[PDB]
Write a protein that binds this ligand. Structure first.
Ligand SMILES: [Zn+2]
Length: 267
């Protein structure tokens, strides 16, 4: 793939419908882990203990402890130059009748903190709950999310004594429910929201330029979004610190930290 930023910016000058796909690499520089990078969440912990439906049925406290920890860390984190370049791009293009849409894998909400509006959160949100009984979805920004989690840090599955009884974990505050809440996120083996997925699909059919920023292009279906668009002849530009399973499908690859590689692309 080309690293000709001039040639890419020519495609950028002519695009009316830009699709920007993002993963944890776009948030790294804000000072939070990725999933599979060094010090990543799935390096430190085993994903099958924390991010599957079975994980949650077998040990909802361990799982909640991990999402609680992440919520408490993320509160004070700020959008980095890559988030900010994306937001300013959307606002600038939007003012001229051109569309920029963000299709994010990240649940951290940092694209909303930056001022981005057209944001599909395809794996849910760190800050939303879903009730296991009634199905109610809610923003929840209580700190701590429940009293029993107050002052809990990152969980060790071997410290059985740190586990909280299930009745003291976050419960639905809807009058007459009290069901157990789970994070409103998409785990391995769970379908993505079909409304979201459908809308994303149409965005990808309409886009005339696609960027793929800070994702390992391992996890499906997100990993095939940009490959799909490229199979229609649309230019895709990858921004990543390394090559991925998908790089050889794309017209451009811009190597480096997105904090520095992305802002001149979007200028
Ligand atoms: Zn409920």
């Amino acid at each position: 793939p080309s690293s000709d930023l001039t040639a890419f910016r020519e495609h950028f000058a002519k695009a009316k419908h830009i699709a920007i796909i993002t993963g944890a690499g776009v948030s790294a520089e804000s000072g939070v882990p990725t999933f599979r990078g060094p010090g990543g969440f799935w390096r430190k912990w085993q994903a099958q203990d924390l991010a599957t439906p079975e994980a949650f049925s077998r040990d909802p406290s361990l799982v909640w402890e991990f999402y609680h920890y992440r919520r408490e860390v993320m509160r004070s984190k700020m959008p980095n130059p890559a988030h900010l370049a994306i937001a300013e791009c959307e606002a600038r293009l939007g003012q001229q009748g051109r569309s920029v849409v963000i299709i994010t894998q990240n649940i951290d909400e940092l694209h909303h903190r930056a001022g981005s509006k057209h944001v599909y959160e395809i794996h849910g949100s760190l800050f939303k709950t879903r009730c296991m009984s009634c199905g109610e979805v809610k923003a929840n920004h209580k700190s701590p999310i429940c009293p029993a989690l107050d002052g809990k840090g990152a969980p060790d599955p071997n410290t059985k004594e740190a586990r909280i009884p299930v009745e003291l974990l976050p419960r639905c505050e809807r009058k007459s429910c009290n069901g157990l809440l789970r994070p409103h996120v998409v785990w391995f083996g769970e379908t993505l929201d079909s409304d979201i997925l459908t809308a994303v699909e149409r965005e990808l059919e309409k886009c005339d330029l696609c960027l793929v920023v800070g994702t390992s292009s391992i996890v499906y279906p997100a990993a095939m979004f940009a490959p799909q668009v490229a199979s229609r002849g649309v230019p895709v530009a990858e921004f990543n610190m390394e090559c991925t399973p998908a790089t050889q499908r794309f017209k451009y690859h811009f190597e480096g930290p997105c904090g520095s590689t992305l802002p001149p692309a979007l200028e």
